[PDB]
Design a protein around this ligand. Structure first.
Ligand SMILES: Cc1cn([C@H]2C[C@H](OP(=O)(O)O)[C@@H](COP(=O)(O)O)O2)c(=O)[nH]c1=O
Ligand SMILES: [Ca+2]
Length: 135
């Protein structure tokens, strides 16, 4: 996979944000993870949702560099959202959320699952440590 620069426009929630990619605005959605809901009514404001949002917001807004890494399959979902692994100062946001027990590994559609195993290892560690979602 290859990383590419991007610029933060606005963090929306734990796993969705607006970035400037190729001088164009885009909403992106993290690959292989699912942070709890804070918006959609027919889902409600789930526990750890506000937490996942703040963890993410803090991480991306205080970063000097943000990079996007698309996987080997399709790059956008049905809603026109960019699908990627996002790094804040070299730290993958997707993994960080999972490691903290603030997101579960979800939506694994091959071939967009190159980092699936790394992430699952991180989730297993958070489970055994009984972190947040796992407590
Ligand atoms: C992460 C991811 C989400 N999605 C879809 C699945 C879900 O569709 P439905 O909304 O139809 O269930 C939605 C989950 O995103 P989050 O709440 O942002 O929904 O986006 C993909 O299609 N591919 C992906 O790789
Ligand atoms: Ca979500």
């Amino acid at each position: 996979l290859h990383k590419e620069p991007a610029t933060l426009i606005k963090a929306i929630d734990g796993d969705t944000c607006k970035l400037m990619y190729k001088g164009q605005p885009m909403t992106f959605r993290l690959l292989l993870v699912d942070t709890p809901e804070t918006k959609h009514p027919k889902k409600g404001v789930e526990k750890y949702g506000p937490e996942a949002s703040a963890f993410t917001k803090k991480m991306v807004e205080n970063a000097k560099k943000i990079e996007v890494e698309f996987d080997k399959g399709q790059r956008t979902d049905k809603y026109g959202r960019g699908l990627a692994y996002i790094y804040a100062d070299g730290k993958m946001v997707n993994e960080a959320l999972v490691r903290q027990g603030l997101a579960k590994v979800a939506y694994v559609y091959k071939p967009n699952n190159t980092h699936e195993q790394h992430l699952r290892k991180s989730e297993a560690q958070a489970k055994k440590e009984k972190l947040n979602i796992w407590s």
